Structure formats: structure tokens, C-alpha cells
Amino acid sequence: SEVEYRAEVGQNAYLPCFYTPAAPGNLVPVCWGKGACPVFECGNVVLRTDERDVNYWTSRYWLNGDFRKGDVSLTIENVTLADSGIYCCRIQIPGIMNDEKFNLKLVIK
Ligand SMILES: Cc1nc2c3cc(-c4ccc(NS(=O)(=O)c5ncc[nH]5)cc4C)c(Cl)cc3[nH]c(=O)n2n1
Numbered sequence: 563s564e565v566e567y568r569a570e571v572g573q574n575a576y577l578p579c580f581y582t583p584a585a586p587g588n589l590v591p592v593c594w595g596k597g598a599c600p601v602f603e604c605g606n607v608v609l610r611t612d613e614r615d616v617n618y619w620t621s622r623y624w625l626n627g628d629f630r631k632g633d634v635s636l637t638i639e640n641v642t643l644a645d646s647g648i649y650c651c652r653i654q655i656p657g658i659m660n661d662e663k664f665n666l667k668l669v670i671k
């Protein structure tokens with residue numbers, strides 16, 4: 563057994579990811595992709611934010627939480643078996659190599 567997130571075909575999938583803004587409104591860029599975080603930046607990119615807003619998304623992928631307070635959890639709508647796999651949520655902390663890397667396993671049946 564290990565940590566995983568689950569959905570049936572047709573449901574939405576919910577993959578958690580959080581950080582804490584250093585001060586209110588001080589956002590840091592976030593990278594969501596399919597594939598483990600050792601791949602490129604955050605895998606095969608599906609969604610990105612910068613210090614101001616979401617700047618990139620792919621159909622069916624959403625940040626529906628309060629991402630301006632650090633809830634950068636992902637929603638995938640209407641999943642198929644092909645959406646199964648590891649996803650990377652990368653918190654791109656400016657000022658060093660110290661990014662926060664989260665790998666989330668999505669199991670679809
Ligand atoms: C037609 C369609 N649109 C989206 C879409 C949109 C978004 C998105 C983009 C910016 C903001 N930021 S915001 O502060 O609420 C704001 N409001 C005005 C200016 N900025 C909030 C969200 C939820 C995302 Cl993340 C994911 C999306 N995914 C997707 O398949 N589609 N499809």
C-alpha cells in the first residue's frame with residue numbers, strides 16, 4: 563500500500579497540493595504536469611501559475627481552490643483510464659534550487 567488518489571472513469575479526480583505564501587498576496591509560480599517531478603520541470607505540463615495568475619492550462623485541468631492562499635490542488639474533470647499515473651506539482655520557490663516537489667499517484671478504474 564502507498565498514498566494514492568482514486569477515481570472511477572467519468573468522475574473528477576482531486577490531487578492535493580499546497581504551499582504557504584511568504585506574505586499575503588505573495589504568490590510563487592506553480593507547475594503541474596503528468597509524470598514524476600524528476601522529468602523536465604514538472605513532467606508533461608498541464609497547468610501553470612505565476613506570481614499573478616494562472617498563465618497556462620489544458621482542457622479538463624483546473625485549480626478550483628483558493629490558489630491565492632496557496633491551495634494549488636488540481637481537479638481533472640471527466641477522467642479516463644489514460645489519466646492514471648504519477649503527477650508532479652512543483653512549487654517554484656525563487657531564490658535557490660529549493661523547489662518543493664510533490665508526486666501524486668492517481669489510480670483510475
Ligand atoms: C474554457 C476553459 N477555462 C478553463 C480554465 C480556466 C482556469 C483559470 C484561469 C485563471 C484563474 N484566475 S482568477 O483569479 O480566478 C481570474 N479571473 C479573471 C482573471 N483571472 C482561475 C481559473 C480557474 C483554470 Cl485554472 C483552468 C481551466 N481549465 C479549463 O479546461 N478551462 N476551460
Ligand SMILES: [Ca+2]
Pocket residue numbers: 654655656657658659660661
Ligand atoms: Ca528554486
